[PDB]
Structures are given as structure tokens and as C-alpha cells.
Write a protein that binds this ligand. Structure first.
Ligand SMILES: NC(=O)c1ccc[n+]([C@@H]2O[C@H](COP(=O)([O-])OP(=O)(O)OC[C@H]3O[C@@H](n4cnc5c(N)ncnc54)[C@H](OP(=O)(O)O)[C@@H]3O)[C@@H](O)[C@H]2O)c1
Length: 349
């Protein structure tokens, strides 16, 4: 058997704690030389780190749809890789495949049914985009705007995006334009991120929530009020944005990342005063889970790919190399180290 590398859950940061590299541990294991029927053996190419992973580090995730990682047991999540051998009928050597439950391990044997074959033509050979803008986060943004945004052509709505330079947010804000908003405004945590948004991703305006006065800034940037709020962050920023939303406007409730290191239910409730404004202005704020919309993934991916291949959709990702950097990359992502999608390159390939 060959010796490969592996990441396991070393320790829990606690429900109110910050996630650290050392919550994860590298190990070496043997990879069997034989596989069975229905199984395939894959070389891992890229792994995703994602904010929903935060809850899996707690003993309870607080939801059926997600189970907690176990200590000393290998961690798993979004991944893309290439088949090195298969005894699964629909899969053969050289196929590129993805899984939501890819073990953080350099080579791995999996059940052939848990995989889906991807077409590199969609991403122009840039496989990592399948875990970002042409994957789950891109779908979340496009489908979210579609199902919850209530943007019509012929309208000239203003959209605001929180977490606007992360995976979801960088994409959401371009889709906003594509779908006929007349104004898209971004809130992110760095000056460098604001530049990306206004100069590369074509956001009409960019605000830094750490160094700026968000409210004053939204007033200048959203002179007609906010009709759509694509919300990835929650907390105090969402409070500012909602205070300035128009009547019958819409919050796309994507994530609430500022709350992820706190012991509080999801989704958290608006404060009494902000809830009051929400009800008074007939603002919609419904829970959005992309996984409830599986049968729109096809068109979704086809659309995003199409926009990318037309030069319309701009894809940003931040790549770190090496399986022994998963922990560090998750920490970096949780604390705004990533521009666009945080991706880990597992292979010398
Ligand atoms: N509803 C669904 O089905 C679904 C599917 C995918 C993702 N999500 C949600 O979408 C959001 C973003 O996910 P993502 O994959 O696109 O990750 P990401 O945005 O690419 O990266 C996470 C970012 O959140 C920002 N952030 C972290 N802590 C913050 C705080 N306390 N206050 C304000 N901003 C903070 C950081 O950038 P800054 O420097 O800008 O602070 C960081 O880069 C999350 O809430 C996630 O859970 C929902």
C-alpha cells in the first residue's frame, strides 16, 4: 500500500470560539492497493473551505442537514478530483469528478455513486471554478437572486451585497447587473477588496465596513434606497442596510457569517427595532437554502459558465497549496484573507 496524507479534526474551538489552524491535524495513512466493485479511486485536485464548515466543528451543528465532524476522524467537504482507476460502470480513468463529501486526503477510494462527472469545457480547464463561481457558491447567488430577489427587467432597483468580495458576494453583485439592477453596491472588509469590486467586478460602489461609516456611505451610494439586499454577513452591517431598505424590498438571506463563532440559533432574529422596520416596510426575509433547488443546478451551471465564457462573469479565487494548509486556509477564509473563492490546491498537477 502507498502512503498518503490526511487531515483530521484535532480539536474543537468551542461554540463561542475562534477557528484555528490547530483545530486540524495532518496524518499519514495507507491507501489500499485494491478497490471493489462500485468503487473508484481518485487523486484529489482541489478542496474547498466554506463558512458552513464552521458549525461542523461544534459538537452539535444545530440542523439535520449537517452533521458534526468527529475528533480524530478525517474531515470532508466540497472537492474536485480525477479518477485514477474505477470499477464503477459510469466512470473511467481520467474522468473529472466532484463530491460534496470529499475526504481531505490526497488519494482516496470512494463509492462511485457519491461522485458526479464534470465537463472541464464549462470552466475552460480551470477545474477549481467548479467549487466556486461555477459551483455551489455561484448557484447560491444566481438561484438566490432568482428565487428571492424579485428583480424584474424594466426595473431600476438598487442592490446591496454584504460579504461582497467573497465567493457568493463577488458573483451575486455581477448577476445583479446582468439581471437589470441599475445600481450595485458592495460592502467588504478591506480597501484592496473595494478596488476589486468597483474596478474589476463593476460594482457601482464599494464600502469598507471596518474603516468607513457604512450608513453615511450607503446614503451617498444608494440615493434611492435599497431594493435588494444580498446578505452574507448579518449582525450590525445588516442592521444598517435594512434601516435603509425601500418598501416591499427584498433580503436574500444567504448567510450570516458575523454570527458563526457565537452560540446563537440560525438564522438569528433581527433586533426588536430592526424587526419593526422590516414589518413596517413590508420587507421580505425568507430562509434560502440552495440545496432545496437541486433541479435548477443544470440551468444554473449552464448560465454561469455561459456568462464566464462570454467574458461577462469575472471569477476571482484565492489559492493556497498543500493539504497541510487546509486548517490555515479555513482560518484565513473565516477572517477575510480570501479574495473571492478560497481554494486549496492539493496536487502538483
Ligand atoms: N444559503 C445557502 O445555501 C448558502 C450556500 C453557500 C454560502 N452561504 C453563505 O454565504 C456567505 C459567504 O459564503 P462564501 O462561501 O461566499 O465565503 P466568502 O464570502 O468567499 O468568505 C467569507 C468572508 O466573510 C467575510 N467575513 C468573515 N467574518 C465577517 C464579519 N464578522 N463581519 C463581516 N464580514 C465577515 C470575510 O471577508 P471581509 O474582509 O469582507 O470581512 C470573508 O472573506 C456565508 O454566510 C455562507 O454561510 C449560504
Amino acid at each position: 500500500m502507498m502512503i498518503v496524507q490526511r487531515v483530521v479534526l484535532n480539536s474543537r474551538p468551542g461554540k463561542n470560539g475562534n477557528p484555528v489552524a490547530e483545530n486540524f491535524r495532518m496524518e499519514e495513512v495507507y491507501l489500499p492497493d485494491n478497490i471493489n466493485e462500485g468503487q473508484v479511486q481518485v487523486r484529489t485536485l482541489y478542496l474547498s473551505v466554506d463558512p458552513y464548515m464552521r458549525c461542523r466543528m461544534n459538537e452539535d451543528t444545530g440542523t439535520d442537514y449537517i452533521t458534526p465532524w468527529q475528533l480524530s476522524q478525517v474531515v470532508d467537504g466540497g472537492g474536485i478530483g480525477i479518477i485514477e482507476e474505477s470499477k464503477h460502470t459510469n466512470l473511467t480513468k481520467g474522468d473529472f469528478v466532484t463530491s460534496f463529501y470529499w475526504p481531505w486526503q490526497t488519494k482516496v477510494i470512494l463509492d462511485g455513486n457519491s461522485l458526479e462527472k464534470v465537463d472541464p469545457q464549462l470552466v475552460d480547464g480551470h477545474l477549481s471554478y467548479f467549487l466556486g463561481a461555477i459551483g455551489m457558491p455561484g448557484l447560491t447567488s444566481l438561484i438566490g437572486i432568482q428565487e428571492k430577489g424579485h428583480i424584474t427587467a424594466g426595473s431600476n432597483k438598487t442592490m446591496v451585497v454584504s460579504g461582497a468580495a467573497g465567493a457568493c458576494g463577488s458573483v451575486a453583485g455581477q448577476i445583479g447587473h446582468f439581471l437589470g439592477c441599475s445600481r450595485v453596491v458592495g460592502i467588504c472588509g478591506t480597501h484592496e477588496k473595494c478596488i476589486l469590486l468597483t474596478s474589476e467586478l463593476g460594482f457601482d460602489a464599494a464600502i469598507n465596513y471596518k474603516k468607513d461609516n457604512v450608513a453615511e456611505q450607503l446614503r451617498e451610494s444608494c440615493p434611492a434606497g435599497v431594493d435588494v439586499y444580498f446578505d452574507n454577513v448579518g449582525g450590525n452591517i445588516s442592521d444598517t442596510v435594512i434601516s435603509q431598505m425601500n418598501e416591499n424590498s427584498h433580503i436574500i438571506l444567504c448567510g450570516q457569517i458575523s454570527q458563526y463563532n457565537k452560540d446563537v440559533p440560525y438564522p438569528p432574529p433581527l433586533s426588536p427595532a430592526i424587526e419593526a422596520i422590516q414589518k413596517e416596510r413590508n420587507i421580505t426575509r425568507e430562509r434560502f437554502l440552495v440545496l432545496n433547488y437541486k433541479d435548477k443546478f443544470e440551468p444554473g451551471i449552464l448560465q454561469l459558465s455561459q456568462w464566464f465564457k462570454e467574458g461577462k462573469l469575472k471569477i476571482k479565487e484565492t489559492v493556497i497549496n498543500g493539504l497541510e494548509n487546509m486548517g490555515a486556509a479555513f482560518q484565513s477564509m473565516m477572517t477575510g484573507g480570501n479574495i473571492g473563492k478560497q481554494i486549496v490546491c492539493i496536487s502538483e498537477e
